[PDB]
Amino acid sequence: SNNVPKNASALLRMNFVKGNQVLSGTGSATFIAPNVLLTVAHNFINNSADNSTGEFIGDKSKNTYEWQTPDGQKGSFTSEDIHFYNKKDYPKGFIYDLAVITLPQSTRRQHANLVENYSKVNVNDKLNVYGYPRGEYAHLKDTTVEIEQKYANNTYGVQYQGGKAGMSGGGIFNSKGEVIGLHQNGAENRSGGLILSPTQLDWIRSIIKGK
């Protein structure tokens, strides 16, 4: 499992369509089943005009998205394949910036494991975070947790140095190489991510066990 985190780390390409015009962006995701990706909701949605709900970037019926792994393999998906943890309350905080993508059953990729049991991450813990800042592969090796934020019971944001734009959606890994969280912010307003709660882990597994 030495190379399992790296080889599960996918680049995301997003093509947001509006009318007959398209704008593109990039992000990151992690394979946690042969045909299931973990990522952030904000690769796909943003705040509604009044911040009351999450809302698709571009036209959801026209958008196209793509994943690519380090070995060069790639595949496509659409909005029909995206499962948001909570699109309605997405604007309320990073606790809801969470999404799972179910790819076709013909996708049979090697993947990392979602952690079986929740383990609280503490300040001064060292994490391993993978992603594609500016679309380029990057591994934040043993980056230290400096600040924690309790979003809800057993639901913590953590801050660690290293993230830049494009890395959001990349995986946070424990020392065994299991997925425990995901990177969410690499902008100038503090790099960090979300450590998945027992509830969020169960929800992801419910999506996996549909596949």
Numbering used by the authors: -1, 684 to 893
Give sentences from the paper:
The 1.75 Å resolution structure of the G. haemolysans M26 IgA1 protease trypsin-like domain is presented. This fold, however, contains many unique changes in the well characterized surface loops that are known to contribute to trypsin-like protease specificity. As expected, the GhTrp crystal structure depicts two molecules in the asymmetric unit, related to each other along the c axis by a tNCS vector of approximately half the c-axis length. Taken together, these data suggest that the GhTrp structure could represent a pro-enzyme-like form of the putative zymogen in which some activation event is required to properly stabilize loop 2 in an active conformation to generate a viable S1 pocket. We hypothesize that this putative pro-enzyme form must undergo a specific cleavage event to generate an N-terminal segment that interacts with loop 2 to stabilize a more open and active conformation of the S1 pocket.
The M26 IgAP family can be split into two subfamilies with distinct domain architectures. The subfamily represented by the Gemella haemolysans IgAP (GhIgAP) contains an additional trypsin-like domain (GhTrp) found N-terminal to the IgAP domain. Prior studies that compared GhIgAP constructs with and without this domain concluded that GhTrp had no effect on IgA1 proteolysis.
